[PDB]
Amino acid sequence: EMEKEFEQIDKSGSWAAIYQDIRHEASDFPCRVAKLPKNKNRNRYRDVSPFDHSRIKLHQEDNDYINASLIKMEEAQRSYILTQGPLPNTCGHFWEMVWEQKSRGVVMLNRVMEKGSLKCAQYWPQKEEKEMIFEDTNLKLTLISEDIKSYYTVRQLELENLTTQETREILHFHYTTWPDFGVPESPASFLNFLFKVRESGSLSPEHGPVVVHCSAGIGRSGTFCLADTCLLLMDKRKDPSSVDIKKVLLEMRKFRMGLIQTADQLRFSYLAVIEGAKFIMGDSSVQDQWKELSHED
Numbered sequence: 001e002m003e004k005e006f007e008q009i010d011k012s013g014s015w016a017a018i019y020q021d022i023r024h025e026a027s028d029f030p031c032r033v034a035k036l037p038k039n040k041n042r043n044r045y046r047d048v049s050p051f052d053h054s055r056i057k058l059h060q061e062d063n064d065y066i067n068a069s070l071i072k073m074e075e076a077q078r079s080y081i082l083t084q085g086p087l088p089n090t091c092g093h094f095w096e097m098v099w100e101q102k103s104r105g106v107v108m109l110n111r112v113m114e115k116g117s118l119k120c121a122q123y124w125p126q127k128e129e130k131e132m133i134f135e136d137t138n139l140k141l142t143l144i145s146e147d148i149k150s151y152y153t154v155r156q157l158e159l160e161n162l163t164t165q166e167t168r169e170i171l172h173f174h175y176t177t178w179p180d181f182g183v184p185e186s187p188a189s190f191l192n193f194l195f196k197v198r199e200s201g202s203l204s205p206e207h208g209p210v211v212v213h214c215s216a217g218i219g220r221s222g223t224f225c226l227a228d229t230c231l232l233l234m235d236k237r238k239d240p241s242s243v244d245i246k247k248v249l250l251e252m253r254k255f256r257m258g259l260i261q262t263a264d265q266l267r268f269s270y271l272a273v274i275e276g277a278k279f280i281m282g283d284s285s286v287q288d289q290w291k292e293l294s295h296e297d
């Protein structure tokens with residue numbers, strides 16, 4: 001049981017060993033396509049690639065490659081697309097993916113600039129009157145509105161397929177205070193944000209998989225998805241004790257390498273799930289508590 005295991009690991013201060021164990025046992029699959037010479041400039045990091053078997057393929061004949069993985073959690077019955085922060089030359093591909101995969105939500109866990117460096121291209125319009133057109137993929141993207149909170153922002157976007165003139169609303173959830181290689185300020189601020197994403201309907205099985213990204217699309221993205229999936233599993237069974245966090249993380253790592261980057265992010269995952277379990281099992285007060293503790297106002 002997660003709560004007992006957590007306290008046991010904390011008492012012996014062996015989170016490093018636990019996390020390293022996961023790295024040791026993690027799946028290893030080929031990333032041949034990602035490593036093709038013609039795709040070098042489509043990758044933000046040399047050492048972070050999507051496995052061939054689970055990679056998202058763009059629906060084009062030229063080059064179908066994007067650094068993005070489909071994490072399909074069979075048991076939980078929810079899927080995520082984890083991807084790197086788009087590059088100046090892959091913003092068109094990013095939005096093509098969103099369109100083709102029928103995603104309704106995009107979760108961004110990083111800032112464009114972190115620690116003096118550019119972790120992600122400016123891939124969405126910052127102003128209503130200045131829409132973006134991606135000529136290579138024939139898509140238009142307009143900022144419709146934004147709801148700015150203290151540590152996160154929610155944007156409404158309109159994505160248009162210029163070829164068919166079909167239009168779709170995309171919800172953009174931007175967590176701006178989650179440090180790279182770090183953890184959220186508190187389980188409360190994290191859960192508050194996760195529930196914002198959930199309550200938008202972006203995770204519904206009626207839509208395509210939500211798109212989740214940070215810079216590399218494995219550390220913070222992995223942490224976010226592990227917590228959500230664990231809460232879902234627990235929800236479906238209404239039994240918190242039935243969820244094996246490490247086993248779920250290992251399952252997720254079958255679909256993309258390196259999910260969750262530090263031992264403390266793993267530890268934080270436990271915190272988030274243990275606290276979130278209160279809502280799952282019928283506590284009607286914790287949701288407001290989190291909102292207050294998060295100081296989103």
Ligand SMILES: CNC(=O)N(c1cccc(-c2sc(C(=O)O)c(OCC(=O)O)c2Br)c1)C1CCCCC1
Nearest residue numbers: 045047180181182214215216218219220257258261
């Ligand atoms: C020490 N690094 C490491 O062991 N690796 C790795 C390799 C290349 C980039 C990254 C980055 S750079 C970055 C950022 O945002 O600057 C980020 O994100 C952190 C977060 O999101 O917390 C991550 Br991961 C990590 C691994 C070796 C290969 C397999 C997995 C990665």
Ligand SMILES: [Cl-]
Nearest residue numbers: 052053054055
């Ligand atoms: Cl496959």
Ligand SMILES: [Cl-]
Nearest residue numbers: 126127128129
């Ligand atoms: Cl504006």
Ligand SMILES: [Cl-]
Nearest residue numbers: 126127128129
């Ligand atoms: Cl303006």
Ligand SMILES: [Cl-]
Nearest residue numbers: 126127128129
């Ligand atoms: Cl303005």
Ligand SMILES: [Cl-]
Nearest residue numbers: 126127128129
């Ligand atoms: Cl204005």
Ligand SMILES: [Cl-]
Nearest residue numbers: 127128129130
């Ligand atoms: Cl304006």
Ligand SMILES: [Mg+2]
Nearest residue numbers: 126127128129
């Ligand atoms: Mg304005």
